[PDB]
């Protein structure tokens with residue numbers, strides 16, 4: 001292995017007091033697992049590649065794959081208006097938003113989170129029915145859980161299924177992810193890590209509206225690397241392969257970052273400075289005018305695809321370059337700085353590419 005994983009990861013774990021981390025890398029078709037520290041600080045139970053971590057917003061890549069799958073299966077087309085697939089949105093602003101804009105955070109300024117008062121399905125429908133766009137559709141990117149959350153919800157229901165059903169019964173089994181969960185079952189609680197807050201309490205995920213779609217997957221590094229493997233020359237089912245290809249399609253760009261379904265990608269080679277900038281709050285916190293594509297673009301293999309994710313007590317990152325057959329998954333039970341995740345992953349990936 002050309003990479004020096006221990007030498008890059010261990011100083012970072014110390015610098016941010018990360019209790020445990022599961023790292024998995026792919027190179028030349030083989031998976032390598034590097035496990036550090038503890039899943040549970042009071043028992044001392046060790047992290048393995050089967051430890052379940054909250055992967056937070058990395059869930060959006062699975063949600064995007066599910067939505068692309070529903071589109072390939074005929075439930076909807078990406079250029080359909082959103083209200084074509086939700087009778088309760090007819091006449092609302094979503095008459096003028098496409099499913100693709102919803103999935104790529106460009107509907108027009110949907111916020112990062114639902115307002116605190118939205119705590120039921122009924123209040124969720126009312127929220128979207130009364131939503132006032134900040135920007136014209138397709139012109140501005142504001143990263144948003146309500147946006148891709150609604151995409152995942154409506155995509156699944158376009159096949160007559162709840163999101164959780166289509167994810168748990170179709171997408172995850174077809175991807176080969178048998179230890180990946182929206183809700184961790186009884187048989188697997190022994191493997192579920194605790195997270196540790198920035199204030200340092202043991203904490204686990206708070207359920208919320210459309211949490212499953214936007215940030216609610218629990219999985220280990222082995223299962224998550226298997227999903228990344230499917231994103232690098234998947235040999236198999238035509239519908240699922242077409243779905244994955246749609247997630248590698250670009251719909252707009254902000255600076256050097258191109259927004260796909262779930263995945264965000266960069267030209268490869270990519271500098272650390274560019275990858276840091278694309279994952280900084282200058283991109284993730286504020287609404288930015290996008291570079292527009294007249295038609296969506298199949299982006300290609302010689303690119304760095306990535307996604308960050310966090311919960312109250314967890315911090316995750318995934319990046320891969322399909323043309324190189326290299327990948328890194330980093331799942332931690334501390335929500336530690338995105339810049340540290342990016343710097344470490346860029347260093348390791350640069351070495352794997354040698």
Ligand SMILES: *C(=O)N1C[C@H](NOS(=O)(=O)O)CC[C@H]1C(N)=O
Pocket residue numbers: 055056057058112143145214215284308309310311312338
């Ligand atoms: C994803 O984990 N989340 C969405 C947003 N952070 O975006 S990032 O993950 O791309 O950095 C807010 C925090 C978090 C969440 N659980 O809502």
